[PDB]
C-alpha cells in the first residue's frame, strides 16, 4: 500500500485459537529500545586480579545492539490457555512461528538546562536483522531476563546483546573471535516501515505432558509367579552350625524386589539434599562447597539443574537437590540472597517412576570377590554405592518438565556427538532454533565541525525507539486416549475466598504469577 | 587392447585435483613382494610358559599372503595439500576410491656358489583378490606399518598378512577359526596383466576440521542476569553465632559458575598425568602399573589412546595423559625405548571447550545425606570425585583429531550395539570399510623327482614380484561460512632460515616429516 | 515506489561473497557532511614570503564541496577476508563497483544564547554528482585521509574537496585553471531521495599476490656445466714474474656468478639506508638533506616511496630506505614527529629475487680503457658504481605490494608517454579510475531584507547532513596451481594469550589495526 508518517503499519493481535490437534498463540507487546554502549563495541573481561575466582573468568564483547527474546512459555500462553493445554493433552511441540515489528517511532531527546524535551525524529531509522545462518554466538537458551512480558499490557525494555569467546583468565587467546554485527545485511526502517519473518521448527519429539501411573519396578502381574529362579539362599538355616548351600526360589507377588525385570532406571548424578525446614540442615554454608559440579578446562561449573532426576521420594516434599531444580522468583524478589518465601521451587516428583531420586544413590554393585575359608583367609562380599551412573543398556527415563514461566527451546551445540540432546533446563533441543532478532537505533551524529577531522564521530543525537512486536507460534497437540476409569488429577484454581485473584493484577496494577505450573497432570501406563 | 611382455599395462598417476566441494587425490608407488612363510600357513601362539604375561597371550595363523595398506593420510595428501585442506575447510570425508595394480614383474633368483643372479620369469603369476564380503579377520585399522610411503619416490615392501582368533593361553578353543586364503576366488596375473577395483564409502559424518571459539560453560550473555534462582547461602552471616537459613540469588555476569545451563561436557575416563620435564614426574616406573586400562576376559589392555579428552588445560602444555595421546616417531627412531626427543606427541587441547581434560576429574557428586543436630548427630555434606563418567543426557563432545601421519578409517565391529562408533585412534568408523587387498606370488616348484611321491612339494623356485600400485580417493569438502572479523589461525611454514626444508629430503635422500599436523585451525561457534 | 519522509530509501548491506574466481565485497557506513567554507570558493596559496621554501609553494582553490573516498583496501575487506585472499590466491584485480547514497537527513542548528538545538529540515537538499568525464582535478590517489572507516560501526566525516593548479611562488599564471563545481549537472536530494551509480573497471593486470621461490641469478641447473666460455684469467700464475695471457673457462655449479644469463634485475634509483637501531645511524638530521629526490621546474620533491626496490637484503631487516617504503601510523599516533614505536614500517623484501635492494647499487660498469705498458704508460681498468639505472633490455621486475591499509588505485596522468604506469605507492593504475563523487549541502539563506539589495546573500541557515553510503566492488581472483611439496607460508594469528584480540575493539571501543598485512605469501617459480 502506501506507508508513511500518518498511517499505521500493523494491528494489535493477541489471541489464541484451538482447532483440532493445533493451538495457535499470537501475542503483541510494546517495546522501548535505548541506545546501548554509546554506539560502541566494547571488550569486556573478568580475571582473578579483580578478586574473582578462576571459575568466573570471561572474555567477550558488549555490542550496541539489542535482541528480542520470546523464549518463555508465558510469552505465548495465558494462565487459562496453559490450563487448557496441560489438562487435556498428553504432549505438545512447536511447529512454526511468525514475527512482526511494526509502528516504529524514533524519538530524540534534548536536554537544555534542567529541561527535558522528547520530540519525534521522523527521518531516523532502526536496523533489524535475523541471524538465520547461526553465525553469531547464540545467547538465547541461557534463561536470561528481557522476555516479552507475560501480561499483554506491560511495556518492556529490549535487552542488550553481548557474547563471550575463549579466555585464559581475563585475557584472550588466538582462537577468540570478534564479531561486528554491522558486518551483516540489515533492514533499515523509518517510522512508516515494518519488519517481518517466518520460521519453521524442525521435527522435535513431543514434550511428555503426563505422569506415569505405573512404576518401573511394578510392571509385573501381581497374581502369577515367575518361571525364572533367583538365588535366594547361600547358607543353611535352623541348625546350630550353619553351612554353605545354594538355594533358589521363584519370584512371585510377595517377593517383587527379587523378580527378573527387563529395564533399569535412568542415569544418576547425585546431588546434595537440602530441607526447607532450616533446622534440619547442617549448620554451615555448603551451597557451593558441597554443590554438584562439573569440571571443564580447570574451571568448576555447577551442574544446575543437571540431568532430570526425581526431586524427592514419597512423603519427603520438604527435600530438594541443592542445585538440581528450577527456582523461579516471586514478583519483586531480590536479586541476591532472597529468602525462601520469596522464591518458588519446582518439583519433578512425577518422574519417581522411571528416574532415580536426585539425592539418593543409583544402586549397589560389588566391590570384591567373596570367598570362603577353604584355602586363603575367608572374605565377606563387599558392596559399593553408585552415586554417579552413565547410560546402561535397558535404561528408560523422562525429561524435565516445562513450566509456564520456564524456557521453551535451546540450541543444540554444534559438536561431533551428543547423548539425548534435550536441554537440561527443560524444553525442546533444536539444531536450528528460532534465529535471534537483532535490533539497533541507527546513530545520528550531532553537528560535525566545519574543518575536516579524520577522527571518528563521537558526538551524536540522543535517541530511543518504540514500537509493537507480535509473535505467533503454532503448536501441535497430542491428545490423550485413556481407558482409566477414575477421574484424573487436574490443575485448578482454589475456590476459597481471597484478597486477590491468582494470575491477575493487584490494587497497584502489578501483575504477578503466584506459583509455577508444570504440565504433568494426566497419566499414562509405562 | 593387446597385453603382453613388451607393452606397459598402466601409467604413473600421482596428482590432486581441487574442484568445488571435492578434492581427488591420486597416488602411485612402486612395491616389492617377497615369498612369505615358504608358501606355508603356520600356527602362531604365545603363552605364559615362554615368559609372557597373561595380557600378551595369543593364538593365530601366519599366512603366505601380503596385503596393501593405504590407511594413513600421508598416503594420499602431500604436506601442501594437507595445508590447503586444513586452512580452508570446516570438514571433510571420503566418498569413493579406485585401486589399480599394474606393470607386474615376477623375477626368479638363482644362487650358485657365492653368485646371485636375478632374471625375469615371464610365465609366473601373482594372485590378487579383495575381501569384498569381509569374511577374513580385518587387520587394517590397527595402525600397522607397511603403508604406501608418504614420499612418492620411495619403494616399499608389502607386509605379510596374519590374523588372530580366540585363545586360552597359548592354546586354541573350539570356536577358534582357521582361514585358508586359497579358499577364495583370486585373479592370476602374468607380467602383461593388471588388476583394478572400485569402492564407494558409505555415508559417514564429516570430520570436525575446526576448533570451537566458545566454551560450553560460556554460552551465556555476559550483560544480562538470569531469571532463574540458585541456592547461594545455607547459613546466616555477620553475627557471632550463625544459624541455618536459605538464601537464593540470580546468576549473572559475575557468578557464571552458578548459572543454570542446558548441557554437560563429554564423558571421562581419567588418565595419569605425565610431564615432559622429567624432574617433575615421580621417581618410579609407572608406565604400566599406573596405566589406564580395561579388563576383558581376565586380560588387561591399555586404554590407548582411549576416549577423546583434552590433553591439558590452559598454560600446561608440558603435561599429557600417560597413554591418552597418539605418539608418532621421528624419522629413524628406535623401536624400543626411544627417547622423548625421538618422538612427536600429539595434543588435543582444541577440545578443552566441550571435552574434559584427560588428567582431571569429571566433576563432583554428593556422597551422603547432610543433616543438622536436631535429633541425631550432625553430619556434614560429603562429596566424591568422579574420575570415570559414562554418557549422561545433555552431553556434548568432539572426536579426536586426525593427522597427516594418522589413520583414516577403521572397521566398526559387527556387534549387537555400539555407542558413538567413531574409532578411538581418530578417523572414520565404517561398517563396510575399504576391503583389504590380498596379494601373493604363485608358488613355482623346482624339478620334482622322476618317481611318484605322495608328499606335498616343498622345493620351489626362489621368486619375488614388483610393480606399481595406484590408489585414487575422492573426498568431499565442507566449506567454512564464518562472520568472524579478526584473522584465523592457520598452519604455516616458518619463514626463518634453516639447514633443510621441512617435509623434504635431506642431503642423503631421506624424506622425513618434522612434526604432526592436525586439522583444527579454523574456528566455529558452539 | 513511494519515497517520502516516513519511508526508508535503502538497507544496510555489509557483506562479502566468495564464488569461484570472484569475490564481491559490499560495505556500508554512516557519514556526516558539514557546510564547508561558508558556501564559498576560496583561492589558497603558499609562497616563500611566509617562510616556506620554494619546494612547498602552491596555488589552488578550496571549494565548498565534499567527496567520497573508498580508495583503501580496508574499506572493502575485513581482516579475515584479507586473509582468505592472500593465503589462497596468486593474484586479484577489481572488475566493477556499485555506489549508493541513501537515508538522507538534513538537519539545521540554531544557537540562541548558550543553547544549541538540532532539528530536521525536511525540505532541504544535498547535491551529488560524479565526475564521469574526468574534467576536474583528480585528488583521489594521493593517499589522503577521509576514507570509509575500516570498522563498519564507525561514523566518519566527509573530507573537503580542494585542488591545485599551476603556480609561480604564491602567484598564478595564465594557464592556471579555476573550476566551479556548480557548473556541473548535479542531482538534488531531499530526505526521501537516494543516489546511485555503477562503474566498470578497465582491463588492468592482476596484482602479483605471491613471492618468487627462485631468484634471477639462480635459474640454472646446478649439476650441468655451460657450453659457453667466459674470460677467467688475464695473467699467468705460479711463476715469479707473471705475464699477460688469456684464459677461458666454462661456467658450472661452483662458479655461478660467472655464468652466462638471459636477464637482468629491474631498474634502480638508490636510496639512503637508515637503521631502526638509532645508535647505528649517523648523528645528524639527514632525512631531507640526504633524501632521494627528483627535480621538476626548479622544485625538489622527495621520491617517496619511489620505484619498487627490495627493502633490504638477507639478514638485514633493521635497515630501510630513508623514503622508499610505505609507513602507516598506529592507532592514535601523532601527526608530526611520531616516534618509531608509533608507526608501522612496511617491507618489500619479497622482491629480492628480481628487484635490486633499495639501499645498494645496481652494479658495476667500466670507466676507462685498460692498456699495458707497450707504448704509452700502463693503465689499470677502472670501474664505476651504478647508483641509478633506467630500463635496459632484458630487465624483469615486480611491482610494490598492496596492503590492507594501503591504496587501491590511482589515475594514470593524461600524457603523451609513460613507462610501466603502475602507481608507485602500489595498486592499479587506471586511465579512467572510479570517478570522484562530489557532495554538498545546498545553501539555505536566512531571512533576506525587505528592501532589495544587489549584494550576494551571505547570511545562511546553519546546516549539516547525515546518511548512509554503500559501495560494492567485484574482484576477480587468480587461483594458484602449484606443485610445491612442502607447506607454504601463510598469514596467521598468534595463538598465544594476549590482553586484546588483534583487529578488534579495546575496552574503550577503539578499533585498531596492529600491523600492516601485505599479499605475498604463496610462492611461484620465476
UniProtKB/TrEMBL annotation, chains A, B, C:
Keywords: Capsid protein, Nucleotide-binding, T=1 icosahedral capsid protein, Virion. One of its GO terms (molecular function) is nucleotide binding. GO terms for cellular component: T=1 icosahedral viral capsid. Its main location: virion. Residues 1-498 form the Coat protein VP1/VP2 Parvovirus domain. AMP binds at residues 422, 429. It is found in: Virion. Belongs to the parvoviridae capsid protein family. This is Capsid protein. It comes from Adeno-associated virus 8. The chain holds residues 218 to 738 of 738 of the full protein.
Amino acid at each position: 500500500g502506501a506507508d508513511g508518517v500518518g498511517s499505521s503499519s500493523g494491528n494489535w493481535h493477541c489471541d489464541s485459537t484451538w482447532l483440532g490437534d493445533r493451538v495457535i498463540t499470537t501475542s503483541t507487546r510494546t517495546w522501548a529500545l535505548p541506545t546501548y554502549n554509546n554506539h560502541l563495541y566494547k571488550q569486556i573481561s573478568n580475571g582473578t586480579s579483580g578478586g574473582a575466582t578462576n571459575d568466573n573468568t570471561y572474555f567477550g564483547y558488549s555490542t550496541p545492539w539489542g535482541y528480542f527474546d520470546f523464549n518463555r512459555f508465558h510469552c505465548h500462553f495465558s494462565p487459562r490457555d496453559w490450563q487448557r493445554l496441560i489438562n487435556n493433552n498428553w504432549g505438545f511441540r512447536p511447529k512454526r512461528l511468525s514475527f512482526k515489528l511494526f509502528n516504529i517511532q524514533v524519538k530524540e531527546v534534548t536536554q537544555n538546562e534542567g529541561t527535558k524535551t522528547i520530540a519525534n525524529n521522523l527521518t531516523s531509522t532502526i536496523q533489524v536483522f535475523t541471524d538465520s545462518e547461526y553465525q553469531l554466538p547464540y545467547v538465547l537458551g541461557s534463561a536470561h531476563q528481557g522476555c516479552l512480558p507475560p501480561f499483554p499490557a506491560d511495556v518492556f525494555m529490549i535487552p542488550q546483546y553481548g557474547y563471550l569467546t575463549l579466555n585464559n583468565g581475563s585475557q584472550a587467546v588466538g582462537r577468540s573471535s570478534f564479531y561486528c554485527l554491522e558486518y551483516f545485511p540489515s533492514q533499515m526502517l523509518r517510522t512508516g516501515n515494518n519488519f517481518q519473518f517466518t520460521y519453521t521448527f524442525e521435527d522435535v519429539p513431543f514434550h511428555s505432558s503426563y505422569a506415569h501411573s505405573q512404576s518401573l519396578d511394578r510392571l509385573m502381574n501381581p497374581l502369577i509367579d515367575q518361571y525364572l529362579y533367583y538365588l535366594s539362599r547361600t547358607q543353611t538355616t535352623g541348625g546350630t552350625a550353619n553351612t554353605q548351600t545354594l538355594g533358589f526360589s521363584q519370584g512371585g507377588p510377595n517377593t517383587m524386589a527379587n523378580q527378573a525385570k527387563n529395564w533399569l532406571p535412568g542415569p544418576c548424578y547425585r546431588q546434595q539434599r537440602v530441607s526447607t525446614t532450616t533446622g534440619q540442615n547442617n549448620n554451615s554454608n555448603f551451597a557451593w562447597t558441597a554443590g554438584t559440579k562439573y569440571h571443564l578446562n580447570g574451571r568448576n561449573s555447577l551442574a544446575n539443574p543437571g540431568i532430570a532426576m526425581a526431586t524427592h521420594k514419597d512423603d519427603e516434599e520438604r527435600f530438594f537437590p541443592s542445585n538440581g531444580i528450577l527456582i523461579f522468583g516471586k514478583q519483586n524478589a531480590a536479586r541476591d540472597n532472597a529468602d525462601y518465601s520469596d522464591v518458588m521451587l519446582t518439583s519433578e516428583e512425577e518422574i519417581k517412576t522411571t528416574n532415580p531420586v536426585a539425592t539418593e544413590e543409583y544402586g549397589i554393585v560389588a566391590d570384591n570377590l567373596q570367598r570362603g575359608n577353604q584355602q586363603n583367609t575367608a572374605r565377606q562380599p563387599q558392596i559399593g554405592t553408585v552415586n554417579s551412573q552413565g547410560a546402561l543398556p535397558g535404561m528408560v527415563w523422562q525429561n524435565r518438565d516445562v513450566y509456564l514461566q520456564g524456557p521453551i527451546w535451546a540450541k543444540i551445540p554444534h559438536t561431533d556427538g551428543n547423548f539425548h540432546p534435550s536441554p537440561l533446563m527443560g524444553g525442546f533441543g533444536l539444531k536450528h532454533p528460532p534465529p535471534q532478532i537483532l535490533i539497533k537505533n541507527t546513530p545520528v551524529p550531532a553537528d560535525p565541525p566545519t574543518t575536516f577531522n579524520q577522527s571518528k564521530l563521537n558526538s551524536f543525537i540522543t535517541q530511543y525507539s518504540t514500537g509493537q512486536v507480535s509473535v505467533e507460534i503454532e503448536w501441535e497437540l497430542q491428545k490423550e486416549n485413556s481407558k482409566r476409569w477414575n477421574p484424573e488429577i487436574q490443575y485448578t484454581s482454589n475456590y476459597y475466598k481471597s484478597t486477590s485473584v491468582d494470575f491477575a493484577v493487584n490494587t497497584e496494577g502489578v501483575y504477578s504469577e503466584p506459583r509455577p505450573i508444570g504440565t504433568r497432570y494426566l497419566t499414562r501406563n509405562l
